[PDB]
Swiss-Prot record:
Coiled coil: none annotated. This is Putative transposase for insertion sequence element IS5376. Involved in the transposition of the insertion sequence. Belongs to the transposase IS21/IS408/IS1162 family. The chain holds residues 126 to 187 of 400 of the full protein.
Length: 62
DNA sequence: CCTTCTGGGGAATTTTAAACCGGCGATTTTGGGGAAAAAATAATCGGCCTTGACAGCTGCACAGTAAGAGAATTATGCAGTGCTGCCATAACCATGAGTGATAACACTGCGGCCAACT
């Protein structure tokens, strides 16, 4: 979710929100980031998997 | 005391009712042909009901990978030059065969001359 552009600490950055929703329990993990690079995507997925205490058997992206 | 009447039983015969089987007369059913009607299917027509769009417009940003465009560098194929050797061709003479030429008549093409119209 591209939140928009904000002046954080006098620096203009493009804030983005990463959301991971479980399908059966409808849990929700989220985290804010300054970039949408493959590295950031993979790290946010690691954070989601740690938060849910495991990895799913299927993950749906766009 | 005796005679006659009657009744029962076994055998023979007759009639009528019932059931089967066959024969005869009638209707039904199957097949084919021709006509008529119904229904099914497809196409075409009119019209009602409902809603999308028209409201400035869409170009840019990011993500990743791949392609490509331009310039520099490298590899390679062509070309150029010299020296030596071998093969091709060409030059001459003879003989045979093909075609270009020559004579004659007939038909046609081109240039010179005459006349008619504007």
């Amino acid at each position: 979710k591209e939140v928009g552009e904000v002046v954080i600490e006098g620096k203009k950055v493009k804030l983005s929100l990463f959301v991971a929703t479980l399908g059966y329990s409808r849990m929700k993990y989220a985290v804010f980031t300054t970039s949408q690079d493959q590295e950031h995507l993979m790290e946010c997925l690691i954070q989601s998997f740690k938060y849910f205490g495991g990895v799913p058997k299927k993950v749906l992206f766009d």
